[PDB]
């Protein structure tokens, strides 16, 4: 089946999901590669017009443990998705609600099993997932952690604004197991998630 790991910004969800997918021996999936594909295709085609292009070409995300692939009209584009120009354009495309909906439609076509990570994987995309988790922590601890890697106050202020957006747009899935990660190492969180997957 499907494991969803959702959480707010600076929640360590991507690192936890990669470790959980590796432990289970299934692919890790996120939205990043699809946003990059949309940007690359918009650039290559020289493009509402973006969505007609994406839908028109036919895009598929292939979930593979060694590294996911993105095909457009049957062509593997994966290796072309990390250029500076894709980097510039992807920031902008990710912000379009219609592109977000398109990414969701493509994720929904990926057959299980996999560990999907994001904010709304267990609600907007895979509400039928058998194993849903929401990793939460106070904004202070997430800021404290991120600041170790700006000052605490700068990061905290940024996180508070991101949390406000997240809360106004979504809530954890009702059947998701919620874990406050405060006080736990990455290993502990990974272990906790796996201990809860029957």
Curated annotation (Swiss-Prot):
It catalyses: CMP + ATP = CDP + ADP; dCMP + ATP = dCDP + ADP. GO terms for biological process: pyrimidine nucleotide metabolic process. It is an enzyme of class 2 (transferase). ATP binds at residues 7-15. Its EC number is 2.7.4.25. SUPFAM superfamilies: P-loop containing nucleoside triphosphate hydrolases. One of its GO terms (molecular function) is dCMP kinase activity. Pfam families: Cytidylate_kin. GO terms for cellular component: cytoplasm. InterPro entries: Cytidylate_kin (IPR003136), Cytidylate_kinase_dom (IPR011994), P-loop_NTPase (IPR027417). The keyword Metal-binding does not apply. Its main location: cytoplasm. It is found in: Cytoplasm. Gene3D superfamilies: P-loop containing nucleotide triphosphate hydrolases (3.40.50.300). Transmembrane segments: none annotated. Belongs to the cytidylate kinase family. Type 1 subfamily. This is Cytidylate kinase. It comes from Thermus thermophilus (strain ATCC 27634 / DSM 579 / HB8).
